[PDB]
Amino acid sequence: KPDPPLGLHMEITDDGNLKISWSSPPLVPFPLQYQVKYSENSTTVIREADKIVSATSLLVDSILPGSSYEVQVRGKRLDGPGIWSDWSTPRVFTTQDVIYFPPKILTSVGSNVSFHCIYKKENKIVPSKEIVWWMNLAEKIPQSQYDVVSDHVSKVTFFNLNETKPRGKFTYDAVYCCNEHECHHRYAELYVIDVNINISCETDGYLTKMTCRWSTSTIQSLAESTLQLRYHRSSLYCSDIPSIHPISEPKDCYLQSDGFYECIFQPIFLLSGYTMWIRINHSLGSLDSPPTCVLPDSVVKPLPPSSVKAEITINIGLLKISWEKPVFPENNLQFQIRYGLSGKEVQWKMYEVYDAKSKSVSLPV
Amino acid sequence: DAVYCCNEHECHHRYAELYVIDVNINISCETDGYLTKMTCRWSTSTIQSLAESTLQLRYHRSSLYCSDIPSIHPISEPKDCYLQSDGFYECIFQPIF
Amino acid sequence: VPIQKVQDDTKTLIKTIVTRINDISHTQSVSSKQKVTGLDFIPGLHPILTLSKMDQTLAVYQQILTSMPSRNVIQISNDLENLRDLLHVLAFSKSCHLPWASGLETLDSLGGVLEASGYSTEVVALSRLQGSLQDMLWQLDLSPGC
């Protein structure tokens, strides 16, 4: 005899279906079959329905506004002469007027999102022609956006979304579904966050570690957001098109005085393609910033050339400049030489040397 | 410095260790303006080269005056010195004789 | 995958490791070619004619460098891994199948030298690595074969 299913929860799907969900008891090492009993008690119709399901969830089509749903589930072993569990504790869910499906949308800039609504007026479902939509109670949405999907339900379609600008604490735009002039209290939440986060890396002058940095300035608008850099290491080189990989590991980043997070990769694999992105784990959903692949050997910030010597050649009268090529990188290098009269402000003349095997240059002065 | 003993051209892995440390450490003291305590200072700059070294100031108090030739005394006591922001250790003798 | 770019990068990684060793002042004063008894397991200058030989040489060096606590040395070991990977892609562009070299099975002896004399192991390993890399760099234009 299994224990009754636990954690019975009820959420509304993006389709406007009532999704009943529960957790399997943690102690059964075998699949369970469930029987779901639910009743729908409206002011005008009582419906009872018994459904048997092998999944840990049930969809109930078209939630009725101003109705109360009572649900019970019991489990039995799927294979063999199993005994039914006792029923779960009854859970009552009494709905409120006006339906949004979905209740919330978490998206990125440039995407398309659409909402659907049903408006219940005095135990009656109004026609879709009557329904009008509003944003943040400030202004009516243009009629061109509305589409009549069905007689009961109206829909708004948004295109080329722009970032939601925060008003005080609130990061999101409140979308309202109203019966003509008069609106209702409940609204739908639309969250648009700039995911365009630049991750730049720099390998130290000894090439012993790689430090990567990224700014918080676009994300200081969302309280409760947590930020986690994730990375995937390739065996060799970076792909032509970087992409999110299902198997990724987090990296410890530390906020610096300059407002940037600093993450040190040590040891570093110079010729392994490190694909990185920021994971934004909102209370409802996870977003990955556009992935970029970085090769540590190709992002080296070299040390300055050492043993720089500038001498004017006797008899010849050329400014002969010499140096020692800097330790890193050992790749062929192009060099840039700035020179000018020494003073409070130096008028730098620029000169570029593209010979890899060049260690000294003579420039007329 | 690793000192090696070799059979002609060919050497062996093991070597002898020779440690030479500048012991010329200047200890300067200063009695506060009310002459209630004496603060002594010395720099770490010569000794920052040896990890695992621990440094302890020791002192021996005479009954009267300083000797013409100072010397290490077998009976000595340590003094608590505290590293300051300027990189110097500061040891306060209070009360002072 | 550009073959020429990979070849140049292979050259670069070799020069890179050589220069790193050049930065290490104590290693510079030590003769690369010179033989030291006990260190013989370290792959020093002995003709490295082929890619498989290069791969096994780099593998042994990686294994030795990994064990020594030094910040520079860990990176050098990493560089050696990348060099091995570069050699593997070159062997692929040449239609060669390079088996992934394991390090030396015979590390049960290396512990003794690391404990008794860390300095000898480090200076020898670095100087011989620099020498081996230099001949490898010389030979990489000679049309290396598998």
C19 contacts in A (CB within 8 Å)? Answer: 327-328, 330
What is the token pair recorded at B84? 């300051």
Strands A187-193 and A104-108: parallel
Question: Measuring CA to CA, which residue among C32, C19, C15 is closest to residue C138?
Answer: C15
C12 contacts in A (CB within 8 Å)? Answer: 297, 329-331
What is the token pair recorded at B31? 């009695």
DSSP reduced 3-state for C88: helix
Q: What are phi and psi of A56, to 5 degrees?
A: -85, 25
Q: Which helix (H) or strand (E) segment is A337 a member of?
A: strand A335-339
Q: How far is B51 from chain C (nearest CA, A)?
A: 15
**Cα gap A91→A74, rounded to integer Å:** 13
C vs A contact (3+ beta-carbon pairs below 8 A): yes
Q: How far is C24 from chain A (nearest CA, A)?
A: 11
**Cα gap C27→C20, rounded to integer Å:** 10
**Cα gap A228→A197, rounded to integer Å:** 12
Q: What does this entry list as its resolution, in Å? A: 6.4
Amino acid at A307: S
* Number of Cβ pairs < 8 A linking chain A and chain C: 61
Which among C25, C75, C84 is the top mutation candidate for probing chain A, defined by the most A β-carbons within 10 Å of its own β-carbon? Answer: C75
DSSP reduced 3-state for C11: helix
What is the token pair recorded at C75? 């990176």
**Beta partners for residue B3, in sequence order:** B16
The per-residue DSSP string of A109-127 comes to TT--EEEEEE-B-SS-BPP
| Unique residue bearing structure tokens 């140096």 | A323
Exposed / middle / buried, residue C125 (Cβ in 10 Å: 0-12, 13-18, 19+): buried
Q: How far is C71 from chain A (nearest CA, A)?
A: 7
**Cα gap C16→C12, rounded to integer Å:** 6
Which among A203, A306, A330 is the top mutation candidate for probing chain C, defined by the most C β-carbons within 10 Å of its own β-carbon? Answer: A330
A240 contacts in C (CB within 8 Å)? Answer: none
Put simply, whether A239 touches C (Cβ < 8 Å) is no
* Neighbouring subunits of C (3+ Cβ pairs under 8 A): A, B
**Cα gap A145→A141, rounded to integer Å:** 7
The per-residue DSSP string of A81-103 comes to SPPPPPPPPPEEEE--SSEEESS
**Cα gap C94→C86, rounded to integer Å:** 12
**Cα gap C42→C36, rounded to integer Å:** 10
DSSP reduced 3-state for C117: coil
B11 contacts in C (CB within 8 Å)? Answer: 36-37
What is the token pair recorded at A341? 């009269």
Q: How far is A266 from chain C (nearest CA, A)?
A: 9
What is the token pair recorded at A188? 């739908």
3-state secondary structure chain B: CEEECCECCECCCCEEECCCCCCCCCCEEEECCCCCCEEEEEECCCCCCCCCCCCCCEECCCCCCCCCCCCCCCCCEECCEEECCCCEEEEEECCCC
**Beta partners for residue C122, in sequence order:** none
**Cα gap A272→A266, rounded to integer Å:** 13
Chain breaks in chain B (C to N over 2.5 A) after: none
Amino acid at A283: S
Strands B81-83 and B88-93: antiparallel
Which CA distances in Å does A185 have to A94, A118, A188, A217, A290?
17, 14, 10, 33, 36
Report the residue of chain B nearest C112, measured CA to CA. Answer: B13
Which among C14, C66, C71 is the top mutation candidate for probing chain A, defined by the most A β-carbons within 10 Å of its own β-carbon? Answer: C71
Method: cryo-EM
**Cα gap C57→C146, rounded to integer Å:** 14
**Beta partners for residue A52, in sequence order:** A35
Question: Measuring CA to CA, which residue among C58, C65, C47, C59 is closest to residue C105?
Answer: C59
**Cα gap A38→A57, rounded to integer Å:** 13
Q: How far is B52 from chain C (nearest CA, A)?
A: 16
**Cα gap A117→A286, rounded to integer Å:** 26
**Cα gap A102→C82, rounded to integer Å:** 50
**Cα gap A26→C85, rounded to integer Å:** 46
Judge: B13–C35 Cβ closer than 8 Å, yes or no. Answer: no
Question: Measuring CA to CA, which residue among B44, B53, B36, B39 is closest to residue B90?
Answer: B39
Strands B38-43 and B77-78: unpaired
Strands B15-17 and B2-4: antiparallel
How many other C-beta atoms are found inside a 10 Å radius of the C-beta of residue A119? 26
C-beta separation of C127 from C27 below 8 A: yes
Cβ-defined contacts of B17-26 (< 8 Å, 24+): B21/B46, B21/B47, B21/B50, B22/B46, B22/B47
Judge: C113–B15 Cβ closer than 8 Å, yes or no. Answer: no
Edge-first strand listing for the sheet containing A99-101: A99-101, A113-118, A154-158, A146-147
What is the token pair recorded at B14? 């093991």
Exposed / middle / buried, residue C76 (Cβ in 10 Å: 0-12, 13-18, 19+): buried
C-beta separation of A305 from A324 below 8 A: yes
Put simply, whether B5 touches C (Cβ < 8 Å) is no
C25 contacts in B (CB within 8 Å)? Answer: none
C36 contacts in B (CB within 8 Å)? Answer: 10-11, 13
* Neighbouring subunits of B (3+ Cβ pairs under 8 A): C
**Cα gap C99→C95, rounded to integer Å:** 13
Q: Which helix (H) or strand (E) segment is A279 a member of?
A: strand A274-282
**Beta partners for residue B40, in sequence order:** B29, B91
The helix, strand and coil proportions of chain C, stated in percent and rounded to the nearest 5, come to: 65, 0, 35
C-beta separation of A95 from A66 below 8 A: yes
**Cα gap C120→C112, rounded to integer Å:** 12
C117 contacts in B (CB within 8 Å)? Answer: 13-15
Put simply, whether B61 touches C (Cβ < 8 Å) is no
- C90-117 burial, b for 16+ CB within 10 Å, e for fewer? bbeeeebebeebeebeeeeebeebbeeb
Judge: B10–C37 Cβ closer than 8 Å, yes or no. Answer: yes
**Beta partners for residue A231, in sequence order:** A249, A276
**Cα gap A135→A187, rounded to integer Å:** 9
The per-residue DSSP string of C9-29 comes to HHHHHHHHHHHHHHH-HHHHT
What is the token pair recorded at A55? 């999944």
> Which of C37, C39, C119 faces B2 most closely, judged by CB atoms?
C119
C-beta separation of A280 from A195 below 8 A: yes
